[PDB]
Amino acid sequence: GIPKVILPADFNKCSRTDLVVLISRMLVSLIAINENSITLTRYHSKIPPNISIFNYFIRLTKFSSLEHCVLMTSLYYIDLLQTVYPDFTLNSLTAHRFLLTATTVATKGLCDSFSTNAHYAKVGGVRCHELNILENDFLKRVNYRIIPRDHNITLCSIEQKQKKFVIDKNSYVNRPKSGYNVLDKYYRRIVQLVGSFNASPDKSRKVDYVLPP
Amino acid sequence: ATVYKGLNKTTGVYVALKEVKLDSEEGTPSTAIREISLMKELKHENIVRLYDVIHTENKLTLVFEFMDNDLKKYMDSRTVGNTPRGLELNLVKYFQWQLLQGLAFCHENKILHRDLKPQNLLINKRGQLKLGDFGLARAFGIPVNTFSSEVVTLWYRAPDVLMGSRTYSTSIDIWSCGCILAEMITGKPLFPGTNDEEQLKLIFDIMGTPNESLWPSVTKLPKYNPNIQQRPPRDLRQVLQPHTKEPLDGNLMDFLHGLLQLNPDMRLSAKQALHHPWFAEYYH
């Protein structure tokens, strides 16, 4: 028998703690499946850190007062990097280092209240220089296309460096909310996916999140 | 941030090279991240284009389309030695037209400039006006908690924003346009404040004090003054006219009033502005 909280249609009016759980769950789920199936990235750690994903998230979340949108964005930044950086693959060997970077960049590029890298580095558990390059790298592989908007990923894909091919391949007007429907889209998605207490990080919060029909 | 003049090698087309060094306790300047970031989102004819970015070692350079001078520089040239002097009205309607056009664009993409002023309005030899420096801008399409920031001048800052507001929208930019305008007409700053205290006074001097009945929400403003020396609105014509050598027609005035309201919600929108009778001739 387990509790059954009902979340708000607006992730802003939702508990920052409840997000980190929903996000973390989703995060180890992708790690499970991605490993269910070589060349290293800056986001690779020499071995799986002992601290769980969730225990690492709240900490970053609490001692750096990361805002809601920044939380969602971080997750979305996964689908963005996995798509425009072939080598990068979310697995329990990149997650943390990614999360640090992801989170500290969504904040700086998108928020009014933001800290310094050295602060972020300290809370995150790494050397400032380590976080600098770790941030510079991610920014290059995305061409500073960090604003979660409907066609961002595509534009990013395209904008990438393109291999010339023998045979050729292949506006937000009228677009609802002017194309800012990404973060909600994901919010809804995670509750539908890892909403129930059936992912793996069961150990963390024993809760069943039901998002109003 | 240090900038230099440069020019394409493949193409002779000149450019502007703003240089932002890398590696620091803050690594990549949030300002750069924010600027570069939004610029890729703002492709319009009245919004300086960001050609490309050149990362390298500990130095990042953003390559902007080189623009000659600016609304500020432009006017000084005109009457730097002859004290304040406004511009030819046809010219005042033209530049104002471009500024609302580019801004109108920003707002549609849910982006607020937040720091509009004469110098942040680049012009090229072709007389084209374009919005600049998006360093303090932000995408309001992303519902984060807002926090105004420190600017070097408060001559274009909205009253409510100066009164501690943190829930403003696109309305903040419209006020600036109102100021920008008045300055282009008369040739000098309409609110030469010297601090948040001073500015608010000068704004209230000509606009009168807030009307808690036409602007109820003002009581919610953190730096609001429940018991302040009320004042009536001084009338615009008799404030500007005497310093402009052309009969400020009716429309210009009505338009000017629509951009210079105290109550944000009463301020005209860039879209609405572009459809004000004062610009009729640009249509049909």
Ligand SMILES: Nc1ncnc2c1ncn2[C@@H]1O[C@H](COP(=O)(O)OP(=O)(O)OP(O)(O)=S)[C@H](O)[C@H]1O
């Ligand atoms: N496109 C350009 N064309 C000509 N000069 C430029 C251009 N961009 C920058 N400059 C020069 O650089 C100067 C100031 O650096 P800024 O570009 O304004 O950086 P900024 O600090 O982010 O914005 P501010 O608040 O206006 S100083 C003047 O605007 C110009 O002399």
